[PDB]
Design a protein around this nucleic acid. Structure first.
Ligand SMILES: [Mg+2]
Ligand SMILES: [Mg+2]
Ligand SMILES: [Mg+2]
Ligand SMILES: [Mg+2]
Ligand SMILES: [Mg+2]
Ligand SMILES: [Mg+2]
Ligand SMILES: [Mg+2]
Ligand SMILES: [Mg+2]
Ligand SMILES: [Mg+2]
Ligand SMILES: [Mg+2]
Ligand SMILES: [Mg+2]
Ligand SMILES: [Mg+2]
Ligand SMILES: [Mg+2]
Ligand SMILES: [Mg+2]
Ligand SMILES: [Mg+2]
Ligand SMILES: [Mg+2]
Ligand SMILES: [Mg+2]
Ligand SMILES: [Mg+2]
Ligand SMILES: [Mg+2]
Ligand SMILES: [Mg+2]
Ligand SMILES: [Mg+2]
Ligand SMILES: [Mg+2]
Ligand SMILES: [Mg+2]
Ligand SMILES: [Mg+2]
Ligand SMILES: [Mg+2]
Ligand SMILES: [Mg+2]
Ligand SMILES: [Mg+2]
Ligand SMILES: [Mg+2]
Ligand SMILES: [Mg+2]
Ligand SMILES: [Mg+2]
Ligand SMILES: [Mg+2]
Ligand SMILES: [Mg+2]
Ligand SMILES: [Mg+2]
Ligand SMILES: [Mg+2]
Ligand SMILES: [Mg+2]
Ligand SMILES: [Mg+2]
Ligand SMILES: [Mg+2]
Ligand SMILES: [Mg+2]
Ligand SMILES: [Mg+2]
Ligand SMILES: [Mg+2]
Ligand SMILES: [Mg+2]
Ligand SMILES: [Mg+2]
Ligand SMILES: [Zn+2]
Lengths: 137, 53, 97
RNA sequence: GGGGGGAACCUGGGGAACUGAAACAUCUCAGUACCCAGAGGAGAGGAAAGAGAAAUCGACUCCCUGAGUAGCGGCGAGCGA
RNA sequence: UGGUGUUGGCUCUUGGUCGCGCCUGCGUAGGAUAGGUGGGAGCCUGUGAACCCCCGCCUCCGGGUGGGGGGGAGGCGCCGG
RNA sequence: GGGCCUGACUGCGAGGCCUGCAAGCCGAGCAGGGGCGAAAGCCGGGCCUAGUGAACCGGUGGUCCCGUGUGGAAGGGCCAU
RNA sequence: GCCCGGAUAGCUCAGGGUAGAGCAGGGGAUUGAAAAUCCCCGUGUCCUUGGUUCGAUUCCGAGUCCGGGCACCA
């Protein structure tokens, strides 16, 4: 890892869970690359990968989002993960939590009807080249 | 009955209540039976589907 | 195996009950008792040897009441015990129970 | 101070079988008979970590009732608050 | 005969599972050892590139990776078949 | 032999055959919702008479009846198998 | 009743990119014979259907059938 990244690592701490708001305040502190990084929200659906019927797929029209308007399409990969762009590192903090939360909502709205586990086994917020923070969905 | 001539229920396809029990021969009739029958529950005829006894 | 010197526990009488079948809870027809018979249940008696006023005293006690013996030795500190035989020391020790 | 005795009665520790189930094993007989330890003119029990539906009662023992009820039961024979 | 009590000290070696770290993935077209999607035009270097000496190794035999001794400014992508 | 079908109905059932009991048997007619037929009408399996097994225990699908102070739940009842 | 499973050519069989191996059959070499040996060749929805992937005997759902296991039987 590069000094630049090693730096950021300090402003994190894995143990801590954080909050949609707490994470939104960090994003900016984590976007140290020469461009408007994104943000991304990585989940980890607690459903069976190799299957169908219980496949999470759809779209969400984020109120602000992207800035690159909304309607992002997301689809769970072969593993139990699902990923999506929630906006660019710019965006005032009180603008991301609105999307993070608006996106996570859609995920729950697309949970199957036959799924074992806590569904959102885990969730994280990040930036294109920065580290990541778990969050209380 | 035998292992091949087997017993079965008919379940009202609308309300899902088993209403009639009958038999069939599963060689001669591998497909699940469909039959219009009177569901006491829905008070009308209703196609019923074979359901494992 | 007999009696706890500390707790008083002695063997009780128990029935050994043989059963068969699948319990109703597991969707079975139920349990049938294919035999009942008396047996005995003994205290887990064990020897405990402790030194007290430089004499060796030894207890037949149920495992459970083992630390009770060490407790009795502790409370024996404030006791005019010296010179006594094992027997009368043990007597004295039990008097504290 | 103990020890030993006492017809029955009493409480504690142990504890059958015939029999009944028109066979028999769970169940019954029965915690009976019997053995043993102890007590006494009685013994046991006894002042709620109780009942159980009454916004209630108020230690324990004994009799009547509740009731062959509620229940228990190879849901059999029977057992039984 | 398993578990467990009575049942303790010190070592050496193992498996399961959880958390973190790191690497492992080779049909065939092909720069050649493509996990899966997703973000994405920059990222690596005085917090030391380019080959080198010992290599922990891994190997599908071409390479993959990795800590260190030398080392003193270029390597790696978008491009694009 | 062909066409359309599922009455191999749900709720009942006057009246009987048979008969120690229990069981077994036949049944017109009314209601519901149907099938076939122009209609009269027929249809509650099969020309008939064997193709079977009481209770008990328990499985499953229903119903929402009971639910040990109360609300639930455990567990039962009822209907079907 | 439930849990684990096998189906791949005539027989027995191993296996995310594929389709083979043993001896049975046939052709040839060799042999006095019978073999053993040696070389070539076949003999496939990889149980069925449905769904992943650019595709699949390979992953998943569902079936059909034999195989195993555990338990229960008023
Ligand atoms: Mg019927
Ligand atoms: Mg039939
Ligand atoms: Mg009804
Ligand atoms: Mg036992
Ligand atoms: Mg029983
Ligand atoms: Mg203990
Ligand atoms: Mg006396
Ligand atoms: Mg006496
Ligand atoms: Mg007694
Ligand atoms: Mg007695
Ligand atoms: Mg005896
Ligand atoms: Mg007897
Ligand atoms: Mg007898
Ligand atoms: Mg008898
Ligand atoms: Mg008799
Ligand atoms: Mg006899
Ligand atoms: Mg008794
Ligand atoms: Mg008196
Ligand atoms: Mg008293
Ligand atoms: Mg008091
Ligand atoms: Mg009884
Ligand atoms: Mg009794
Ligand atoms: Mg043992
Ligand atoms: Mg041990
Ligand atoms: Mg016809
Ligand atoms: Mg009908
Ligand atoms: Mg009559
Ligand atoms: Mg009669
Ligand atoms: Mg008409
Ligand atoms: Mg008419
Ligand atoms: Mg009629
Ligand atoms: Mg019986
Ligand atoms: Mg029953
Ligand atoms: Mg109720
Ligand atoms: Mg109620
Ligand atoms: Mg209660
Ligand atoms: Mg209640
Ligand atoms: Mg409540
Ligand atoms: Mg219930
Ligand atoms: Mg019920
Ligand atoms: Mg099964
Ligand atoms: Mg084969
Ligand atoms: Zn119905």
């Amino acid at each position: 890892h590069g000094k630049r990244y090693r730096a950021l690592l300090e402003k994190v701490d894995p143990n801590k869970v954080y909050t949609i708001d707490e994470a939104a305040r960090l994003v900016k502190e984590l976007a140290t690359a020469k461009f408007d990084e994104t943000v991304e929200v990585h989940a980890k659906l607690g459903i069976d990968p190799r299957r169908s019927d219980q496949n999470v797929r759809g779209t969400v029209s984020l109120p602000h989002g992207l800035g690159k308007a909304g309607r992002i399409e997301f689809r769970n990969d072969k593993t139990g993960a699902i990923h999506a762009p929630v906006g660019k590192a710019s965006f005032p903090p009180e603008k991301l939590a609105d999307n993070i939360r608006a996106f996570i909502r859609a995920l729950e709205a697309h949970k199957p009807e036959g799924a074992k586990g806590t569904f959102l086994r885990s969730v994280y917020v990040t930036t294109t080249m920065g580290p990541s923070v778990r969050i209380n969905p | 009955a035998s292992e091949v001539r087997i017993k079965l229920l008919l379940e009202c396809t609308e309300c899902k209540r088993r209403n009639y029990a009958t038999e069939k021969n599963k060689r001669n009739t591998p497909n699940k039976l469909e039959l219009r029958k009177y569901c006491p529950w829905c008070r009308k005829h209703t196609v019923h589907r074979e359901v494992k006894i | 195996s007999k009696v706890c010197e500390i707790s008083g526990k002695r063997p009780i009488v128990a029935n050994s009950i043989q059963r068969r079948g699948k319990a109703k809870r597991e969707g079975g027809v139920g349990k049938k008792t294919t035999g009942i018979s008396k047996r005995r249940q003994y205290p887990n008696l064990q020897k405990v040897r402790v030194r007290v006023a430089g004499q060796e005293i030894t207890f037949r006690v149920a495992a459970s009441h083992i630390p009770k013996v060490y407790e009795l030795v502790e409370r024996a500190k404030g006791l005019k015990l010296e010179g006594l035989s094992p027997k009368e020391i043990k007597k004295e020790l039990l008097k504290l129970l």
